[model samples]
Target: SMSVKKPKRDDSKDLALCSMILTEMETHEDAWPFLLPVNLKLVPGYKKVIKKPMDFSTIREKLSSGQYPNLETFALDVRLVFDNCETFNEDDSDIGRAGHNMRKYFEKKWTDTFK
Candidate 1:
């Protein structure tokens, strides 16, 4: 017996919401620090420490390419962007502050959209 289930209709709806939230996050004022991958030269030792680097651009690409199998997976990548920032930056620093703001924005959006 062989069984392979195709993507459910609900998945598309979930993805569309994810896309909208991501777009809003991109335009957020504090999003600059996370718009792209951290520069290897500018942030020395970043690659060695933050092994799983994630960013807005990478998430956009992954979503477009249909890499996320479920909404939870997409959410995980989004959270990683903020979590990694906290790991590499001081809470009072610019990037650190932006990370906190952006996470707050994301949580609110997630609750409003999904709850």
Candidate 2:
């Protein structure tokens, strides 16, 4: 099992999640094409939310003030879903397998509200 300190924001957590997902795809060869597009889609959104225009201290203050609702929860949910889906069989390189697993995990957690 891989481990890293949890990030405090949704965007950072998503980037970390995407990196892990991409690494798995790289190691598994056949998982590349499908996983690459999914990984790319996550980047722009992450950048938009986490751009350097915002001060770190202010962001932390906003979070502490509850102005941001619960970013940590969103981050945790995304990480959990990605980790679960990435743990499939070690042997096969069957197409769509990773995506299928991810879809199932996503639908199950889609109803969760951060509020």
Candidate 3:
């Protein structure tokens, strides 16, 4: 079977959703890894800490450059990212179990929204 590739999608709603997620993530330090779209290199404002974290300038550009080749692959990737991560850093350290907490948060929020 051949996989179909699409030019992202109706990214306006997606962008708003992503921004909402990013807004929630901004409360923590080193939040780039959890959401996956954020990057320190292209996000601007270099410093030991970032006070106001609204890095939307390059976000849509980067998103537009990406192709959603396989929604199935992305579903797999979702499980791999949120569900398949290590449980926690022993209830301490900087990691702060964001992966686990995020998984719960996403599950609940998505369920609430869609249901």
Candidate 4:
């Protein structure tokens, strides 16, 4: 007789946080017009805020109005933002503070869930 393997619990369907980051993303040569309203100034001087690549507006919108079913996926999305960024340290920099804060909240919730 053959028995089918059972599926494990899908803990991936958890939501703990929402955050997005941008690191070393390219800027547009004609991006000044696009960035006029983004209003970010602390970014690395060498870095450019061309628009989509460097803009977090979409992320903000999704985070505010979107619903994520997986915490792991959520964390990963936030990590991808600053993965190539050079100005944020994810610990001590203002730029990385949001990512770090979300990670902290995620860890706490994960720990709490197990308890």
Judged by whole-model lDDT over C-alpha atoms, candidate 4 comes out at 0.40
Q: Candidate 2 on 10-115: residue-level lDDT in tens? A: 5545434433433443354433433322332554453444322222233334444546534455344344434433442232445337645544444444433222
Q: Which residue pairs come into collision in candidate 2?
A: none
What clash pairs does model 4 have? 21-81, 23-85
Q: Pairing residues by index, what is the TM-score of model 4?
A: 0.35
Output the worst ten-in-a-row residue range by lDDT, candidate 2.
50-59
Off by over 4 Å in 1: 1-9
RMSD of each: 3.4, 15.1, 9.6, 10.3
| lDDT digits (tens) for residues 1-115 of candidate 3 | 2686766555346444544543554454544445443355875542324432323233334334553243333223433444323432333544447666755665565455334
Residues 87-106 of candidate 1: C-alpha lDDT, one tens digit per residue: 99999999899999999999
- Evaluate all candidate structures by whole-model CA lDDT and list the values in order: 0.94, 0.40, 0.44, 0.40
| Candidate number achieving the greatest lDDT relative to the actual structure | 1
Using lDDT as the yardstick, the better of models 2 and 3 is 3
- Backbone clash total for model 1 is 0
C-alpha lDDT (0 to 100) for residue 8 of candidate 2: 55
Residue 34, candidate 3: Cα error in Å is 3.4
* Sort by TM-score, top down from the best: 1, 3, 4, 2
Stretches of candidate 2 above 4 Å error? 1-69, 91-115
